[PDB]
Short mmCIF file of C-alpha atoms and ligand atoms in Angstrom, two decimals:
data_model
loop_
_atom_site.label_atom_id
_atom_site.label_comp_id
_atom_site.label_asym_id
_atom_site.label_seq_id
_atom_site.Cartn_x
_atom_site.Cartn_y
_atom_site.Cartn_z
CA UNK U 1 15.19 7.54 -11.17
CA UNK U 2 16.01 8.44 -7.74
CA UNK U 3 12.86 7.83 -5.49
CA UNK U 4 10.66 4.40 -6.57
CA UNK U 5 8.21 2.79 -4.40
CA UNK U 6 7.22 -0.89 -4.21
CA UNK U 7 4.41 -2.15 -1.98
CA UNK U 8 3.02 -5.59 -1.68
CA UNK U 9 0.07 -7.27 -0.53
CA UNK U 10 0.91 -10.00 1.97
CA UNK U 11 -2.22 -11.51 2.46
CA UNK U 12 -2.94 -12.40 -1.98
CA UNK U 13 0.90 -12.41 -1.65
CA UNK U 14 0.65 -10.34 -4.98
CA UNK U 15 1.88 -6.88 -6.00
CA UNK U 16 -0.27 -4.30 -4.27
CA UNK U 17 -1.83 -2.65 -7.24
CA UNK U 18 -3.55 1.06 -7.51
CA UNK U 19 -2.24 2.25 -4.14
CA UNK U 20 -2.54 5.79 -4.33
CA UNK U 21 0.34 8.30 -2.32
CA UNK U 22 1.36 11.71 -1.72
CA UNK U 23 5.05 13.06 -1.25
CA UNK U 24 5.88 15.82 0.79
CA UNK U 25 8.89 17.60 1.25
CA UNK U 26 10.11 19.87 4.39
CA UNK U 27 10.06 23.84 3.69
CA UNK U 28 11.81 25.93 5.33
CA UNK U 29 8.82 26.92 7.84
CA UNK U 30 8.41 23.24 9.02
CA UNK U 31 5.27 22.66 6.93
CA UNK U 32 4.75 19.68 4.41
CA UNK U 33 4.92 21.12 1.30
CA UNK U 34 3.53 18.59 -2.02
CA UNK U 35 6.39 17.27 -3.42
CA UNK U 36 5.16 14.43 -6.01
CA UNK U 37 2.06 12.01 -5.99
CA UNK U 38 0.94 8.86 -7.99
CA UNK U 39 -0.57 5.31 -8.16
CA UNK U 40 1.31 2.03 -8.03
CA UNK U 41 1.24 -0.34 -11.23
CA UNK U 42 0.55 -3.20 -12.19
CA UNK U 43 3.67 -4.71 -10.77
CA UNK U 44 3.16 -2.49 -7.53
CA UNK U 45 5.73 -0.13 -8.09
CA UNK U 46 5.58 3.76 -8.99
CA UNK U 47 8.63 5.29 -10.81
CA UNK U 48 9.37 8.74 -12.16
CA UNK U 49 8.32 10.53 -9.14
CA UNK U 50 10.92 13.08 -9.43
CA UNK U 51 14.50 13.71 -10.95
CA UNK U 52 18.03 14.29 -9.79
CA UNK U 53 18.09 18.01 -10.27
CA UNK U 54 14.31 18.19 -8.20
CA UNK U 55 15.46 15.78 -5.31
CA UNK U 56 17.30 18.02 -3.52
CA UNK U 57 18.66 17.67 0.10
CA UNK U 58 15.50 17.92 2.89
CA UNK U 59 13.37 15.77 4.82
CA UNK U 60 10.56 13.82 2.66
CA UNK U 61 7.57 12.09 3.86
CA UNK U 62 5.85 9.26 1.67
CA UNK U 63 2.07 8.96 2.46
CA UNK U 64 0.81 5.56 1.24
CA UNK U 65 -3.21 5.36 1.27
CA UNK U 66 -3.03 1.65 2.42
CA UNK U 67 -6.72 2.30 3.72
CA UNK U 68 -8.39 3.11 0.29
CA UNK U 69 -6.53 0.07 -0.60
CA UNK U 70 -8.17 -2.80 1.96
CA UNK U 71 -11.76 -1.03 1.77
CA UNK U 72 -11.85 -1.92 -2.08
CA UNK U 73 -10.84 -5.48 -1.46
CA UNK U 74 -13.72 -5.31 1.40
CA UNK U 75 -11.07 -5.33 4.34
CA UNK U 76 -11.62 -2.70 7.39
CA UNK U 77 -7.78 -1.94 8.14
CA UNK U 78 -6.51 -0.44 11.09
CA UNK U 79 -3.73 1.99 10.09
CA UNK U 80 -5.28 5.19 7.94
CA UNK U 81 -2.12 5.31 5.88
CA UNK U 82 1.66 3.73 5.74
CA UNK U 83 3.78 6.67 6.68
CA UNK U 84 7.92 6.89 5.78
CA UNK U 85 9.49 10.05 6.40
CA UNK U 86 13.17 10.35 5.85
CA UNK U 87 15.89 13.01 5.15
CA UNK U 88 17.73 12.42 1.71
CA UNK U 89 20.31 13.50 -0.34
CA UNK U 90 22.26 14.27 3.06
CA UNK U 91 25.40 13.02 1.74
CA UNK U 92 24.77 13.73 -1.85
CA UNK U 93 22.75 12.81 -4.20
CA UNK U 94 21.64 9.01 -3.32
CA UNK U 95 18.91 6.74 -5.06
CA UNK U 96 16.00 5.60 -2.58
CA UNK U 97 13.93 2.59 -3.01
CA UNK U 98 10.81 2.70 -0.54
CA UNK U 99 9.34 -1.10 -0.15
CA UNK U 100 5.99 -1.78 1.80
CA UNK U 101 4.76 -4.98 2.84
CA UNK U 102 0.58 -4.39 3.84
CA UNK U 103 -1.55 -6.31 5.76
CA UNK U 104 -4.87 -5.41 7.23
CA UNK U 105 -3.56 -4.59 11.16
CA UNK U 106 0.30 -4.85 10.08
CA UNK U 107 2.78 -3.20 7.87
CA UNK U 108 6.27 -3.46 7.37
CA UNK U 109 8.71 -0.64 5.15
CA UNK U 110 12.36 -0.87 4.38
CA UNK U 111 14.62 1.33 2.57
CA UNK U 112 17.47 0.66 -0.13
CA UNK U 113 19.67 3.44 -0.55
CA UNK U 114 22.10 3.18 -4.02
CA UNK U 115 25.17 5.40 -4.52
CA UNK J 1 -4.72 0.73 29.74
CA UNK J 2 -7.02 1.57 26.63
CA UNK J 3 -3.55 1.94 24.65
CA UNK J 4 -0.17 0.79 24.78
CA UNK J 5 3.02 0.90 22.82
CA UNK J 6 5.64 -1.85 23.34
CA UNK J 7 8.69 -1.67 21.05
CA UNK J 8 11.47 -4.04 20.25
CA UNK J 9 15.21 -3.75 18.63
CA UNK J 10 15.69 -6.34 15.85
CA UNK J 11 19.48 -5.28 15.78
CA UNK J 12 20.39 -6.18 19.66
CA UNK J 13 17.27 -8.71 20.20
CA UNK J 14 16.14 -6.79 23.17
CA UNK J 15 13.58 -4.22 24.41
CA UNK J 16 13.84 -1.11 23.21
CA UNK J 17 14.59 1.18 25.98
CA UNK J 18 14.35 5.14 26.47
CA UNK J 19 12.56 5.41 23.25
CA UNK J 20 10.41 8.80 22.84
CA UNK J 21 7.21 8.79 21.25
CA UNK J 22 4.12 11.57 20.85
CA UNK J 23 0.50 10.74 20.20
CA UNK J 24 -1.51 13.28 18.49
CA UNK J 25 -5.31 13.36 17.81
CA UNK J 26 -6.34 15.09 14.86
CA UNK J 27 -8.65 17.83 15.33
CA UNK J 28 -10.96 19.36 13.11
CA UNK J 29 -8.66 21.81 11.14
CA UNK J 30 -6.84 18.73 9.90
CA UNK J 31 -3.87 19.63 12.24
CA UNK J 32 -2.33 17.17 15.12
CA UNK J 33 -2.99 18.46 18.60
CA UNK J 34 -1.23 16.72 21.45
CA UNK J 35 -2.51 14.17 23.85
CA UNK J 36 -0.11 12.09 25.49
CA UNK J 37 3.93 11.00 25.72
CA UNK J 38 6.13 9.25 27.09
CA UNK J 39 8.98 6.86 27.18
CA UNK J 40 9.83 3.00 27.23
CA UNK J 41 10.57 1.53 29.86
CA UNK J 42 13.27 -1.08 30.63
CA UNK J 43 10.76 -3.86 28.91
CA UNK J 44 10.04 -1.39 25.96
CA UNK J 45 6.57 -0.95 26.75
CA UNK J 46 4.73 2.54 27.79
CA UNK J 47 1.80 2.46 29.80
CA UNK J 48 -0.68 4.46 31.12
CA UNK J 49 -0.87 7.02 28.21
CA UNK J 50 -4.55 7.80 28.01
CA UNK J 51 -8.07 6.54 29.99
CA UNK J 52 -11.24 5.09 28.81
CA UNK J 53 -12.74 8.37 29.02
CA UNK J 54 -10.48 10.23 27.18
CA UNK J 55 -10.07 7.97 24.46
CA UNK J 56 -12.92 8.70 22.20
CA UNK J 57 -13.24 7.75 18.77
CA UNK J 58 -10.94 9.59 16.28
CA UNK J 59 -7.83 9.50 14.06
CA UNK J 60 -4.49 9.26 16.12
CA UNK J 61 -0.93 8.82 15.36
CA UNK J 62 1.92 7.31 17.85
CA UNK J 63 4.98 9.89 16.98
CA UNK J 64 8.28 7.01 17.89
CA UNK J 65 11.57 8.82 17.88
CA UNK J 66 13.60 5.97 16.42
CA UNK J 67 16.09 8.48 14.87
CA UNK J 68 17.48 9.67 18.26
CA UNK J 69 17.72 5.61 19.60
CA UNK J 70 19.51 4.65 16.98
CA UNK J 71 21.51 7.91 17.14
CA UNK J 72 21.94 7.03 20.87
CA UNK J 73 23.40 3.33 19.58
CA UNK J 74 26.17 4.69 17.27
CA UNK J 75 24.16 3.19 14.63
CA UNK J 76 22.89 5.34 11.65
CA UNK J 77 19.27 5.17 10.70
CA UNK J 78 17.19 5.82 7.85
CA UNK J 79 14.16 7.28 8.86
CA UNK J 80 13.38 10.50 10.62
CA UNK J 81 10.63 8.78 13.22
CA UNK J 82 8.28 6.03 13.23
CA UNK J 83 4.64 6.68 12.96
CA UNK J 84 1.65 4.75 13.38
CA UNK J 85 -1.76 6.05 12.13
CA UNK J 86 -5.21 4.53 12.90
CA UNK J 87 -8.17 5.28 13.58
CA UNK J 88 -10.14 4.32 16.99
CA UNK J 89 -13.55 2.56 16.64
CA UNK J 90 -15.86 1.74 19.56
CA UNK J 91 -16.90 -1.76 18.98
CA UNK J 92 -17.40 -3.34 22.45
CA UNK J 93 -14.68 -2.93 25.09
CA UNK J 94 -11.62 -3.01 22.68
CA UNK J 95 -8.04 -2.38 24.15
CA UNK J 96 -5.08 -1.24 21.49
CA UNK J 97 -1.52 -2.58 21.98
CA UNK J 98 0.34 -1.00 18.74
CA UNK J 99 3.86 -3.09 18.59
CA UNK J 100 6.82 -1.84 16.44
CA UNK J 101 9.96 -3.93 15.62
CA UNK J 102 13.49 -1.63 14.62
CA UNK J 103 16.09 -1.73 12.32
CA UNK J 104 18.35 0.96 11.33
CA UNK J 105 16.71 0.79 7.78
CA UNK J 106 13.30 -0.52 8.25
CA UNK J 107 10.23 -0.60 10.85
CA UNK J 108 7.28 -2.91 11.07
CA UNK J 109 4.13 -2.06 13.14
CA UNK J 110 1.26 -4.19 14.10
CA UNK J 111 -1.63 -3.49 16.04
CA UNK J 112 -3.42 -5.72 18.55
CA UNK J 113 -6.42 -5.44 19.12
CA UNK J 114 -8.66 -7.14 22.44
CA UNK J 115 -11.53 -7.34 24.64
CA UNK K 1 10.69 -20.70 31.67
CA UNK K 2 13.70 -20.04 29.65
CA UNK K 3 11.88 -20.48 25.85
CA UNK K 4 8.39 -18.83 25.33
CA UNK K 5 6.90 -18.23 21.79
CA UNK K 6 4.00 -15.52 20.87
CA UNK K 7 2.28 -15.27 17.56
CA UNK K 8 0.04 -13.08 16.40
CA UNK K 9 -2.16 -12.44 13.34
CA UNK K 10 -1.83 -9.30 11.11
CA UNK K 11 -4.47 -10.02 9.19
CA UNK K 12 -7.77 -10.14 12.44
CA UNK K 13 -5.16 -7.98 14.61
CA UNK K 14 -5.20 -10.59 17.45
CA UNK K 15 -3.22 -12.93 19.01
CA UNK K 16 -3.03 -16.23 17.31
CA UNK K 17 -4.50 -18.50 19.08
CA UNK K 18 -4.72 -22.28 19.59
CA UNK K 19 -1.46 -22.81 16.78
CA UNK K 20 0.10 -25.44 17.40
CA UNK K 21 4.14 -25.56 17.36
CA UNK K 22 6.99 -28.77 18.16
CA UNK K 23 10.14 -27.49 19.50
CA UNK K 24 13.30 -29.70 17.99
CA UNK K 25 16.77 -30.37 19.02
CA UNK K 26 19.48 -31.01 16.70
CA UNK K 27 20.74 -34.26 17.57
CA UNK K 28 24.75 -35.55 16.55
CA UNK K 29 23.53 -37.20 13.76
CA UNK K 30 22.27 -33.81 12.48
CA UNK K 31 18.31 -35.40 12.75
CA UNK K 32 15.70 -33.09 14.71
CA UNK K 33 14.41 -34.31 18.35
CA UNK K 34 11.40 -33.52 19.28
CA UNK K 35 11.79 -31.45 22.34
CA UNK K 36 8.80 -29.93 23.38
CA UNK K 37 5.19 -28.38 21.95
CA UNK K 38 1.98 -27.14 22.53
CA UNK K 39 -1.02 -24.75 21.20
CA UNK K 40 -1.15 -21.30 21.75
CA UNK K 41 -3.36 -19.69 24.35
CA UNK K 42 -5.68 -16.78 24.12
CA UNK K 43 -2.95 -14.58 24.95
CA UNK K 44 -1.22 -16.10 21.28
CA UNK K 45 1.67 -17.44 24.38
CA UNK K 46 3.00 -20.90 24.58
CA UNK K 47 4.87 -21.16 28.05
CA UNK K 48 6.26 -24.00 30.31
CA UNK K 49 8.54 -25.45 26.75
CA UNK K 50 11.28 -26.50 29.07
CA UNK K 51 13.50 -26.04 31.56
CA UNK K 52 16.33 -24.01 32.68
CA UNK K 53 18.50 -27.07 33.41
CA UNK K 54 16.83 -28.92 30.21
CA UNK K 55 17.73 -26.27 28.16
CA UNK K 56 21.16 -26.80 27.50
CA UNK K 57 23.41 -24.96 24.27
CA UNK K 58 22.33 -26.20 21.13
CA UNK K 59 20.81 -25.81 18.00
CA UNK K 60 17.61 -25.48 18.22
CA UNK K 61 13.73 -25.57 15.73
CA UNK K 62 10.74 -24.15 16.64
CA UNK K 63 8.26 -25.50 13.58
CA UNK K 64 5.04 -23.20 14.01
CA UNK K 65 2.16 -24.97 12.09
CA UNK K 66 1.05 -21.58 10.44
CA UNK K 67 -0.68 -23.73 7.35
CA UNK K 68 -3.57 -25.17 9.71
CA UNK K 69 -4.16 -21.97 11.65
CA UNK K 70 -4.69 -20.23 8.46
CA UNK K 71 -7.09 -23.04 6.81
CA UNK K 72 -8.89 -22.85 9.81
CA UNK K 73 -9.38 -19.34 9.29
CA UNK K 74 -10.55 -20.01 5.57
CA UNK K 75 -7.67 -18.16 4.29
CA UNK K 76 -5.46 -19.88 1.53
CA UNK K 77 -2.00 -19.97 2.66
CA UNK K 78 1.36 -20.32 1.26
CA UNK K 79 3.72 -21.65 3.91
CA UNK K 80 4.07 -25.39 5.22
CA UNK K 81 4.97 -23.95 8.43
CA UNK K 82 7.07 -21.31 9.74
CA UNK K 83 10.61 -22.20 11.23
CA UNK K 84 12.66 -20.66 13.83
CA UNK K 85 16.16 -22.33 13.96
CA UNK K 86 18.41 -20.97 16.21
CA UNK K 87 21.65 -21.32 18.46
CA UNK K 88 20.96 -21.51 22.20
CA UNK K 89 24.21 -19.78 23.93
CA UNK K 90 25.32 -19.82 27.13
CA UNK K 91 26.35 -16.14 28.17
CA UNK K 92 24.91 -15.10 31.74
CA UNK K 93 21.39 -16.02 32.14
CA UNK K 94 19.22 -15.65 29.37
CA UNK K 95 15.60 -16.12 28.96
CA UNK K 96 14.25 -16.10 24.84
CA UNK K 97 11.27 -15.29 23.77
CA UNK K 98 10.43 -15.99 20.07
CA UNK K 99 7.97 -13.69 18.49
CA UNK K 100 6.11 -14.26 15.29
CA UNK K 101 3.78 -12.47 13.10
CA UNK K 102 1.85 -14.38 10.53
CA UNK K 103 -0.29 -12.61 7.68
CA UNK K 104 -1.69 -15.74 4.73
CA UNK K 105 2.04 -15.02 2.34
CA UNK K 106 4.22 -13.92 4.17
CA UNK K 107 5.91 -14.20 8.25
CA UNK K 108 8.35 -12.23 10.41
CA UNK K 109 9.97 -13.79 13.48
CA UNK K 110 11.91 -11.88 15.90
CA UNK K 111 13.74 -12.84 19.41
CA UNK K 112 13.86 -11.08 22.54
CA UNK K 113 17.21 -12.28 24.57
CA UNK K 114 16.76 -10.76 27.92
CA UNK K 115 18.20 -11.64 31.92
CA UNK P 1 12.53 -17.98 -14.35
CA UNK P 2 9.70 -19.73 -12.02
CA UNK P 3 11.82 -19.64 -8.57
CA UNK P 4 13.36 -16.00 -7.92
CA UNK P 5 14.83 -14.82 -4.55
CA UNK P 6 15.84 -11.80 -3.09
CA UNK P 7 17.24 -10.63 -0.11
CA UNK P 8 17.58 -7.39 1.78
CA UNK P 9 19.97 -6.23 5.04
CA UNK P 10 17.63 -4.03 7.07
CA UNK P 11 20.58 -2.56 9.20
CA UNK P 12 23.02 -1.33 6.15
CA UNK P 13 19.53 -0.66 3.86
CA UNK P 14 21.15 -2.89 1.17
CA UNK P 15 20.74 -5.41 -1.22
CA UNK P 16 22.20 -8.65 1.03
CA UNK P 17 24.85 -9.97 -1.53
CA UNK P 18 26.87 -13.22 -1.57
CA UNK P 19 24.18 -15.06 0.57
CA UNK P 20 24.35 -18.94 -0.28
CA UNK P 21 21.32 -20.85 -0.09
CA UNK P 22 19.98 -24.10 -0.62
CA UNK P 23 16.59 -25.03 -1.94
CA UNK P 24 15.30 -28.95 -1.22
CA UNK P 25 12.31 -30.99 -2.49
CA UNK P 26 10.51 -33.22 -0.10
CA UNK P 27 10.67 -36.51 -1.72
CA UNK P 28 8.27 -39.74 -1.89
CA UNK P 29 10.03 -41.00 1.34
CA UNK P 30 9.52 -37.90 3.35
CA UNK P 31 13.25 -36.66 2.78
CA UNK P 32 14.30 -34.05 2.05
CA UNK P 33 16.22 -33.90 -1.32
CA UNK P 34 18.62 -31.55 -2.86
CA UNK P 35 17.10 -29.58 -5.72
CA UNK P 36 18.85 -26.59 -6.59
CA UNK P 37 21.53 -23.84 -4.82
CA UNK P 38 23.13 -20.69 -5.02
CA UNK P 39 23.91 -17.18 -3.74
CA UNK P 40 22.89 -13.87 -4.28
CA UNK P 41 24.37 -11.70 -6.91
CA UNK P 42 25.32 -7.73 -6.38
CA UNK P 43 21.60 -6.97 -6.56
CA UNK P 44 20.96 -9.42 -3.63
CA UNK P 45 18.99 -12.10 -6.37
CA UNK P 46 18.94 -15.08 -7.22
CA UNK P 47 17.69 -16.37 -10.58
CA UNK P 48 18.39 -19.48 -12.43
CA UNK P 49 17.61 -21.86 -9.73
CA UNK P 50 15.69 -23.94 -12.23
CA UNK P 51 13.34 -24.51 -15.36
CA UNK P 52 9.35 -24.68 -15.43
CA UNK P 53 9.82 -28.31 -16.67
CA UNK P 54 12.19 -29.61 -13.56
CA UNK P 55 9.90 -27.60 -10.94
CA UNK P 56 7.58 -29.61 -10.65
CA UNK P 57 4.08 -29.82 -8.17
CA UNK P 58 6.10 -30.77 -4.72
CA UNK P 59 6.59 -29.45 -1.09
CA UNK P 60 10.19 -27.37 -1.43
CA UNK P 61 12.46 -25.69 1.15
CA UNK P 62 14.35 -23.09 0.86
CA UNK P 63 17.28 -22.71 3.44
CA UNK P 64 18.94 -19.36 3.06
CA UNK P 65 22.16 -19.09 5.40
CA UNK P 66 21.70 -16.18 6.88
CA UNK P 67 24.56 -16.69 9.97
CA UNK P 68 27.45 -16.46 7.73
CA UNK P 69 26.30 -13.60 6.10
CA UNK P 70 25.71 -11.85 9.37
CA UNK P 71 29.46 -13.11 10.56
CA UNK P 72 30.78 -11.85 7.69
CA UNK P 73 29.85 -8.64 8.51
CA UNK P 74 31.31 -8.93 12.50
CA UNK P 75 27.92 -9.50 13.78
CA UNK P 76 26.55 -12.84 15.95
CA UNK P 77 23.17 -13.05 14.81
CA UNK P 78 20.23 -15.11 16.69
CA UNK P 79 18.90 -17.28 13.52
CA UNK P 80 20.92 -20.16 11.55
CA UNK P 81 19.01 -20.22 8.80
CA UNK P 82 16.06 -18.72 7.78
CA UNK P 83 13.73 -21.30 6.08
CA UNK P 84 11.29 -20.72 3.79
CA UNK P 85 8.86 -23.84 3.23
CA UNK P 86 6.20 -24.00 1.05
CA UNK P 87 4.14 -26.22 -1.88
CA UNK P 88 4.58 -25.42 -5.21
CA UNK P 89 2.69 -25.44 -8.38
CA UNK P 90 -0.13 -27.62 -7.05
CA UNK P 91 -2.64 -25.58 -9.03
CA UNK P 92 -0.44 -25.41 -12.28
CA UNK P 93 2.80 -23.93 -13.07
CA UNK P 94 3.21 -20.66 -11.04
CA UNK P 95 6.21 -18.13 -11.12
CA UNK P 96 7.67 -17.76 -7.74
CA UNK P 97 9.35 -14.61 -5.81
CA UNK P 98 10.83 -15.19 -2.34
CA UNK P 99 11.93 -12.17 -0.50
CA UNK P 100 13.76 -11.50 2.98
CA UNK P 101 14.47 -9.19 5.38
CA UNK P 102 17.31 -9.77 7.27
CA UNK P 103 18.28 -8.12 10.54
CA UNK P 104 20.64 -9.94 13.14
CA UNK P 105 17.53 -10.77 15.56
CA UNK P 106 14.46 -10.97 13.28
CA UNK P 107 13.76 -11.69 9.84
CA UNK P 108 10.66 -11.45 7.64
CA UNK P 109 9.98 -13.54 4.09
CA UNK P 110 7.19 -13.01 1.99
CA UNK P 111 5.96 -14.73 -1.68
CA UNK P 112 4.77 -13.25 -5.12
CA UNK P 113 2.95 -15.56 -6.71
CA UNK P 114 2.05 -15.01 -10.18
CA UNK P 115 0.27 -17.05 -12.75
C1 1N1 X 1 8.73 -10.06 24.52
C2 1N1 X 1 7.29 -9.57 24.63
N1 1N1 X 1 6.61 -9.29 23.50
C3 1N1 X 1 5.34 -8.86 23.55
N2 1N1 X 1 4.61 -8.55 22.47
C4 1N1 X 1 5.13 -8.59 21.24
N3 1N1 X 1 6.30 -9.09 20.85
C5 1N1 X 1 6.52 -8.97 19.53
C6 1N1 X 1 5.51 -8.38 18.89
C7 1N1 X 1 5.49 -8.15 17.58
O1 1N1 X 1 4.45 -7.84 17.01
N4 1N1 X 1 6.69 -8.28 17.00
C8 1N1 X 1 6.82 -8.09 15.68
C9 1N1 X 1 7.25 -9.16 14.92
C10 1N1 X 1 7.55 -10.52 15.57
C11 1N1 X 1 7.40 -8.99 13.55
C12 1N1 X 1 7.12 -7.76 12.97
C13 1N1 X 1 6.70 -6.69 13.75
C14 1N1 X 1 6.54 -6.84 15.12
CL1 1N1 X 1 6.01 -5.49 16.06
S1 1N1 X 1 4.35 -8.00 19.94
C15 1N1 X 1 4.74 -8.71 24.79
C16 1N1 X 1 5.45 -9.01 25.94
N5 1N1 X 1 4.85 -8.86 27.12
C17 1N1 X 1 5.38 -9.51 28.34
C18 1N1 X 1 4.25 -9.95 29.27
N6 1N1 X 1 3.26 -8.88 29.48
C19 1N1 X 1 2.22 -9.36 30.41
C20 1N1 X 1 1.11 -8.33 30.58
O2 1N1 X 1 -0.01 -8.92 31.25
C21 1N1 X 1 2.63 -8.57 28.20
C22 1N1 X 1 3.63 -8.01 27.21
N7 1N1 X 1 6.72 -9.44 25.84
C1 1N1 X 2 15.55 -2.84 -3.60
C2 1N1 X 2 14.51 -3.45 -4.52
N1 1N1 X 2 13.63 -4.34 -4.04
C3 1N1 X 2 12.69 -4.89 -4.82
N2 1N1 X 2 11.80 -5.79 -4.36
C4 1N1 X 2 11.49 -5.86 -3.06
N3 1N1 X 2 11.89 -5.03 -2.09
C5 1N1 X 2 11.41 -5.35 -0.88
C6 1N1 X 2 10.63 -6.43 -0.85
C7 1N1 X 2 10.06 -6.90 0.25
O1 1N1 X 2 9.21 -7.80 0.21
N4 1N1 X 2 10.49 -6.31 1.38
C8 1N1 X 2 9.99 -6.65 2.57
C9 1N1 X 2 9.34 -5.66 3.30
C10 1N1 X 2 9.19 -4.24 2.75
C11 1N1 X 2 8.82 -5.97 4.55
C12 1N1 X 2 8.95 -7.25 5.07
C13 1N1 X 2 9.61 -8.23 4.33
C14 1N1 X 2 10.14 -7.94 3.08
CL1 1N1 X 2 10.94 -9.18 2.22
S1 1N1 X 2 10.50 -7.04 -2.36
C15 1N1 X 2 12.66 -4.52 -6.17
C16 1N1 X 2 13.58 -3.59 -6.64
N5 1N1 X 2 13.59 -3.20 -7.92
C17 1N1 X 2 14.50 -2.12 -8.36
C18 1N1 X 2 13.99 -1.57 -9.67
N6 1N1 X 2 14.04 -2.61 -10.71
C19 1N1 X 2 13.44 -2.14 -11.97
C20 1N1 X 2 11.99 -1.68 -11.77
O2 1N1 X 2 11.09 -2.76 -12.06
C21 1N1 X 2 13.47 -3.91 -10.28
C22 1N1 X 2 12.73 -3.85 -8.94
N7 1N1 X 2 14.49 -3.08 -5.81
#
């Protein structure tokens, strides 16, 4: 599994659960092409996103719906979405863990990048 | 000074300096049209970057070129930019300071929010 | 003022105000001194900690009482406090400022070492 | 495993492995009392630190020595420790997940708490 996701919810200090995103990759005329999408479980992560063959190299852009997120727990955030966009794969294949830490006017990301 | 945009370097514990950044407004066909740039200064703040006027209600994203800073550093970096996505609300005389903290693998963004 | 602290909230989007903080000293003995404290202003700033000749190389705690900002708030919270411990070093003239963001489970703390 | 911790290097995008730390429990007498230690494994965790039966309802610190780490790696950093203080269990057992985010200037910790 080469691309997982993890986000958390810093204010229940719990696994942020149901967060919907969207995964674009770069084409060739500069224009976000849909790349993968899917929900985070019940322990906040999504896996299976894509495979090794699929990941090629390119620039890839994770779209986390953070807002959906705070509205259902009756929160009015201010960002409309956590954005990570990052080229992969540069150096050969590589395994990418995207983390997200939310809160309502705040978030934080980090990557972990696995040979 | 409806907006501003002070940044920091969590590697060197300083202001970041010289760092690009782009703020787009979306416009109705979904796409990101252009409003304002600029750079940060030598306390890692930019200024002056739109008026009261101008600064209507909307969806807007701060563009931060953290690739080239870090490039600029000797220091290689994981993502392609930093980007900060909100939307603007009139609710009484509100001013936006959106901060963002750097690391060569990971950014955290917070917005303030004042009278 | 060599030594200022700001905190702010990500979970209103505000500076955190009136939080209260003691500034310690490691002594020989390796017990803490109190040093210095104060409340936050409006701003989420706590200036005038000290003094350039005061502040002399050391090791050095900055105990942020996070716990009763957040009960105040009516938000459960899972820190005591947050601490900044740090080495105070003597290379050209320095001014720190201590930066912290506070959201109910979780904190980040960053320094700004300028001249 | 009630008490988990795991740390992450935000300027290498890493697990942060071989980082010792020490977790206390504040005792009748207001000291603070050695209750369990370690260091991270390859995967930048720590598990094992102790039982549901030993970890009892009780104020704990944990002291994670993040300056060696950071020396280790040919880097001063500003922090000597970052400290993670919090009370456990005072609703019942809970299982407990520390994470960090180190840089050399800043860190961030949150808590999973799960019942
Ligand atoms: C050194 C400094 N820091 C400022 N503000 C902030 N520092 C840090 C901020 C912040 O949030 N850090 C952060 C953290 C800690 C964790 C995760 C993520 C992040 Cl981003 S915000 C403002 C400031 N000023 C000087 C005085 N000017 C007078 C104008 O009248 C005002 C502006 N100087
Ligand atoms: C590299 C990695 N990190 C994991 N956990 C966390 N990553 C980051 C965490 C975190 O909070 N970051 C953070 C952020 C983002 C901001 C501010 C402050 C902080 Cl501290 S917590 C889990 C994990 N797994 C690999 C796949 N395994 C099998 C599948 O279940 C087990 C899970 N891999």
């Amino acid at each position: 599994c080469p691309l997982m996701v993890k986000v958390l919810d810093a204010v229940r200090g719990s696994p942020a659960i149901n967060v919907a995103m969207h995964v674009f990759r770069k084409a060739a005329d500069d224009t976000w092409e849909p790349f993968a999408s899917g929900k985070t479980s019940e322990s906040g992560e999504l896996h299976g996103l894509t495979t090794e063959e699929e990941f090629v190299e390119g620039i890839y852009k994770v779209e986390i719906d953070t807002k959906s997120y705070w509205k259902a727990l009756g929160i009015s955030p201010f960002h409309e979405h956590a954005e990570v966009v990052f080229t992969a794969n540069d150096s050969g294949p590589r395994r990418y863990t995207i983390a997200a830490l939310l809160s309502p006017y705040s978030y934080s990301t980090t990557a972990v990048v696995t040979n």
